[PDB]
Ligand binder design. Structure first.
Ligand SMILES: NCCc1ccc(Oc2ccc(O)cc2)c(I)c1
Lengths: 58, 338, 270, 233, 233
């Protein structure tokens, strides 16, 4: 019967994902936030550029 | 027997859930509450592209931030010039039921596919002045739903037979096959370094895959309905999804836990497509309500509405340098905002 | 004093409706079907009628005199005729389009395209243009009755249009029977078909929209065109008061056209 | 991808002949066609031009009322009509394919040419200071071109072309828009400029680099050619 | 558009805009239909008489100088919820039912109920075909099979007065045929609120008259749609 074979592979795959290293949740909050200020000065959508440096004027 | 295997799977799931719960330390909203809000964003339509007959399903920006390609329900591919509003190419398709389209990073090829269960590759740079098909990728059982280029000889396709695959244009053979999903896969996203990719299916789950290894590494859950579109954060450790329950979530690869939720009580429709800005500060998502809401990726506050379409928005796209944003809709009209 | 206010409401009511329909169709991309272009042209025509013809005719009716020249009376007669014919032709073409849509369901989109609507629009503005100016300026209608006609209108300084016996019949059969019979035939056939359909689907709204269209048209034009025809055949007895009265039923028809052809429909109301 | 021309010969003054250029191997109906004249011992010169849709036609200021151009899409054949040939109307004629869109490379392929012998202002002036120079097989070579007006446009494009016709064969294309390299050209040729003066730099050198280099511009469409510099090894 | 290259690009764009006008006319004159059924239902035989992991099939037929395009779903999974929203603008949907097996009729009624109530399939009429009618006649004359064994309500049924039994070979055959038809009729009329309709028909093995039936049904469907829009219905 192939029913046992299908469940056997499913059990093996689940235990592989359980052995991973997890970082602190609040630690990833700072890393995600830090990238925002480091690139906020080069975001045309965030800061509306004047009508002279954009190619979509008029 | 099947009795002990089910209990073992359940207890592995319980252990994983307990580990994830213990990993939780604090909410990102609490950390971000001490930053001033972005404010009010007001974009206006700068260009309008006309010429499509039937409904528009997908589009993709070019790497030069000037050219783009769009697909229509009538079986036509059109390449647009965003600056001068000119038309460069018009490629008729053998099958009119196309559902996705892609543009090569090098700018030499384009791809499309649909209910025909075939992914086609078109060559744009030929000695003779005409666009001709190069290879057709056959082997999938369901309908093609998404496709993204890796280089001039590698492509990743998503199909409705619950399986993903990695192809090789030179040989036309399935190099790798990805299995595990129970429902059909609707969308996929690629990382900037092209080492890993994610996808979402109708089983309300998302999985992370390894290109060389061909095996799943991590799984994400939390949505109450099917997944319609997925986008990947610029850093490389996060991604966002969109579903039909008026709800979007952000997931962290390293933290293995759901982040804040972007939803509103005045929205009862479903999300069709999602995208990020160049700096990842603003989140843009299309909906069934004919509008394109703009959210704050850090404070979960909606700031900006992109209205002007006469039907549902089916696709979105943010250019490489962040100069503009393009939207598509079922009214066969494309609008460029700024 | 009461008479002035009565004719002032008609002038205000026309321009408003026509400018609304002329904006709603040029700006909104949803209503870019070939069918709406003819409605847009008709709206432009009655806006022009309302913003040219109505004011001077008013001073005139009231002063019971025309103190603005003789190289202007002629211009007015010619632009009043021309613009009435364009509106009637637009109505007839609308009826023809409705018939084509109703009686040919599987070939409506193929036969009714932009290339036919454009031809219809040209034809409607051009055909009266080569007719009204030619008969007024070259005087196709004053032949043989110059003495009596002038004795009646020129000696008194009037500006009322004058017409002869055969010029009159021409007028009738080009600006009333030719579009008047079309409409009627089309809308008689359009009623019996709808009846059967409802019978079947159930085994009427047709009697209430069609019966209104026909009726508005005919109250506004049957008395005026007929009187004119018999006016010469009897001995020119109509008083000028009754004559302008008859006149104020064409301007009434151009006021009520758009409230009947645009707002009565859910699609556009939305 | 090959072009064949027919016609030519020797005729008496005041005669008339029809020249044809036959295309084969590509979608001829989507490329514009040009006629380029070259005297036996002089440089190149533009003649006429017909667009892909036949909606635009230009003629040289030298002759406008005597030359007629025509094309036929179904059989892929170009035509040229000449009436009342003069003494000056003796040179080599070529038909040049060209397509115009974003990122395109016009003037990429040339024909073989047919000879025709006849018995006896506001345009931008393009000049080349030098005409010949001996070099070493392995050193660097610099070729300079000059213009009487700024070729830079408001958009940001500089319309400069390099051809380098070989001594005995048809011309080719090396650099288009003063900065972009062609397809089959080895990655050793380069070009640079500032707006009025331009230079062509060749890093290495081989026996196949012998030839005459030509200078052309496409700013406001006078289509004036340069003088040409010959290289001997 | 000041430069000549920009003008040529504009001309090319205008050419592209003019071949996209011919397509419109052809699209505005065609009608699209969707074909649905099951393994037992002989839809393949019907589409063959009308005339690899393939995804979708296409069949073309013409009647009275009117072109119809029909799309048959090929090798696909058992789930149809997702891709059914791409056919919300077709003229009509053709459904084929095999009236020869038992509880396969029950599956057909379940599928018809599922399709009829679909939200994305509103404003779409359904044409119903009852295929393989000769097997039904041959399966009741020999006995050995009773409808009442599966449907207990067959006993409390009779031939309606409005019935028109053109063959009239046996009253039992007509009774069973009208019971089977009236099942689908009651399912169809259970809802709809007059926006869409059902057109059942009796189809034989060959039945070389289905094209006329489809033409008449499509004609009837578009006339009611136009009468609803101009308020006459
Ligand atoms: N609008 C009512 C005032 C009015 C309008 C038009 C008129 O002239 C004609 C127009 C068309 C014809 O076929 C014959 C005559 C006249 I006289 C009076």
């Amino acid at each position: 019967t192939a029913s046992i074979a299908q469940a056997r592979k499913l059990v093996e795959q689940l235990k592989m994902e359980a052995n991973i290293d997890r970082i602190k949740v609040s630690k990833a909050a700072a890393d995600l936030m830090a990238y925002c200020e480091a690139h906020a000065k080069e975001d045309p959508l965030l800061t509306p550029v004047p009508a002279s440096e954009n190619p979509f004027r008029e | 027997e099947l009795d002990q295997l089910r209990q073992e799977a359940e207890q592995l799931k319980n252990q994983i859930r307990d580990a994830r719960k213990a990993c939780a330390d604090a909410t990102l909203s609490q950390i971000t509450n001490n930053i001033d809000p972005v404010g009010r964003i007001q974009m206006r339509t700068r260009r309008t592209l006309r010429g499509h007959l039937a409904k528009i399903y997908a589009m993709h920006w070019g790497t030069d931030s000037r050219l783009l390609v769009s697909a229509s329900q009538d079986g036509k591919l059109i390449i647009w010039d965003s600056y001068t509003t000119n038309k460069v190419h018009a490629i008729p398709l053998r099958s009119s039921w196309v559902m996705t389209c892609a543009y090569a990073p090098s700018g030499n090829y384009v791809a499309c596919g649909g209910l025909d269960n075939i992914c086609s590759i078109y060559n744009l740079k030929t000695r003779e002045g005409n666009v001709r098909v190069s290879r057709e990728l056959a082997g999938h059982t369901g309908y093609l739903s998404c496709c993204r280029f890796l280089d001039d000889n590698q492509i990743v396709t998503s199909s409705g037979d619950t399986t993903c695959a990695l192809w090789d244009i030179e040989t036309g053979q399935q190099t790798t096959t990805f299995t595990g999903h129970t429902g059909d896969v609707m969308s996929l996203s690629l990382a900037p370094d092209t080492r890993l990719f994610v996808s979402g299916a109708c089983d309300a789950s998302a999985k992370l895959w390894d290109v060389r290894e061909g095996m799943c590494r991590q799984t994400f859950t939390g949505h109450e309905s099917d997944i319609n579109a997925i986008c990947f954060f610029p850093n490389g450790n996060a991604f966002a999804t969109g579903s039909d329950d008026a709800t979007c979530r952000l997931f962290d690869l390293r933290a293995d836990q759901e982040l804040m939720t972007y939803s509103h009580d005045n929205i009862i429709c479903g999300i069709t497509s999602v995208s990020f800005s160049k700096s990842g500060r603003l989140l843009l998502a299309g909906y069934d309500d004919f509008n394109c809401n703009v959210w704050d990726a850090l404070k979960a506050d909606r700031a900006g509405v992109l209205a002007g379409h006469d039907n549902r928005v089916s696709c979105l796209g943010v250019t490489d340098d962040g100069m503009a944003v393009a939207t598509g809709s079922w009214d066969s009209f494309l609008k460029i905002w700024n | 004093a009461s008479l002035y206010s009565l004719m002032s409401l008609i002038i205000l009511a026309t321009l408003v409706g026509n400018l609304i329909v002329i904006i709603s169709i040029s700006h909104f991309k949803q209503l870019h079907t070939p069918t709406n272009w003819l409605l847009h042209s008709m709206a432009i025509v009655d806006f022009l009628l309302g913003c040219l013809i109505m004011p001077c005719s008013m001073v005139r009716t009231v002063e019971r005199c025309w103190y603005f020249g003789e190289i202007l009376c002629k211009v007015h007669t010619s632009t009043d005729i021309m613009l009435s014919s364009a509106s009637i032709f637009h109505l007839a073409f609308i009826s023809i389009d409705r018939y084509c849509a109703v009686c040919d369901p599987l070939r409506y989109k193929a036969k009714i395209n932009i290339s036919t609507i454009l031809v219809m629009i040209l034809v409607s503005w051009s055909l009266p243009a080569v007719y009204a100016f030619g008969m007024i300026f070259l005087e196709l209608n004053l032949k043989g009755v110059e003495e009596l006609y002038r004795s009646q209108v020129s000696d008194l300084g009037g500006c009322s249009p004058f017409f002869s016996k055969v010029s009159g019949v021409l007028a009738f059969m080009t600006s009333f029977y030719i579009p008047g019979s079309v409409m009627l035939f089309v809308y008689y056939r359009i009623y019996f078909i709808a009846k059967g359909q409802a019978r079947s689907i159930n085994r009427t709204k047709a009697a209430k929209t069609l019966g209104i269209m026909v009726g508005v048209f005919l109250v506004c034009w049957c008395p005026f065109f007929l009187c004119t025809v018999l006016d010469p055949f009897l001995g020119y007895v109509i008083p000028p008061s009754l004559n302008d009265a008859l006149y104020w039923f064409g301007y009434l028809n151009s006021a009520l056209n758009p409230m009947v052809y645009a707002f009565f429909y859910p699609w556009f109301r939305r | 991808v090959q072009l064949v021309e027919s016609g030519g010969g020797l005729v008496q003054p005041g005669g008339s002949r029809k020249l044809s250029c036959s295309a084969s191997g590509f979608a001829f109906s989507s490329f514009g066609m040009h006629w380029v004249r070259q005297a036996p011992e002089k440089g190149l010169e533009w003649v006429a031009y017909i667009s892909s849709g036949s909606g635009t036609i230009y003629y040289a200021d030298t002759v406008k009322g005597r030359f007629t151009i025509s094309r036929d899409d179904p059989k892929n054949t170009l035509f040229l009509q000449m009436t009342s040939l003069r003494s000056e109307d003796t040179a080599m004629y070529y038909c040049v394919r060209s397509i115009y869109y974003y990122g395109s490379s016009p003037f990429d392929f040339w024909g073989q040419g047919t000879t025709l012998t006849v018995s006896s202002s506001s345009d931008i002036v393009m000049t080349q200071a030098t005409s010949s120079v001996p070099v070493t097989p392995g050193e660097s070579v610099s070729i300079s071109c000059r213009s009487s007006k700024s070729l830079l446009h408001s958009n940001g494009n500089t319309y400069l072309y390099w051809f380098l016709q070989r001594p005995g064969q048809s011309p080719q294309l090396l650099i288009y828009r003063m900065s972009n390299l062609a397809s089959g050209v080895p990655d050793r040729f380069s070009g640079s400029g500032s707006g009025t003066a331009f230079t062509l730099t060749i890093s290495r050198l081989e026996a196949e680099d012998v030839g005459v280099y030509y200078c052309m511009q496409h700013l406001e469409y006078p289509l004036t050619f340069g003088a040409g510099t010959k290289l001997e090894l | 558009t000041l430069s000549a290259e920009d003008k040529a690009a504009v001309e090319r764009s205008k050419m592209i805009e003019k071949q996209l006008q011919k397509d419109k006319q052809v699209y505005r004159a065609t009608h699209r239909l969707l074909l649905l059924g099951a393994d037992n239902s002989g839809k393949s035989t019907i589409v063959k008489q009308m005339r690899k992991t393939s995804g979708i099939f296409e069949t073309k037929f013409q009647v009275d100088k009117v072109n119809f395009h029909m799309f048959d779903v090929g090798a696909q999974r058992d789930e149809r919820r997702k891709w059914i929203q791409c056919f919300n603008d077709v003229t009509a949907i053709i459904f084929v039912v095999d009236s020869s097996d038992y509880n396969r009729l029950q599956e057909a009624l379940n599928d018809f109920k599922s399709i009829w109530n679909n939200r994305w399939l509103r404003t779409i009429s359904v044409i119903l075909f009852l295929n393989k009618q000769d097997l039904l006649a041959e399966k009741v004359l020999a006995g050995k099979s009773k409808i009442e064994d599966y449907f207990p309500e067959f006993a409390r049924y009779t031939t309606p007065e409005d019935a028109t039994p053109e063959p009239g070979e046996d009253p039992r055959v007509t009774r069973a045929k009208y019971f089977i038809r009236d099942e689908f009729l009651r399912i169809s009329t259970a809802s709809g609120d007059g926006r869409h309709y059902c057109y059942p028909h009796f189809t034989c093995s060959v039945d070389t008259e289905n094209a006329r039936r489809i033409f008449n049904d499509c004609r009837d469907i578009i006339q009611r749609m136009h009468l609803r829009q101009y308020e006459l219905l």
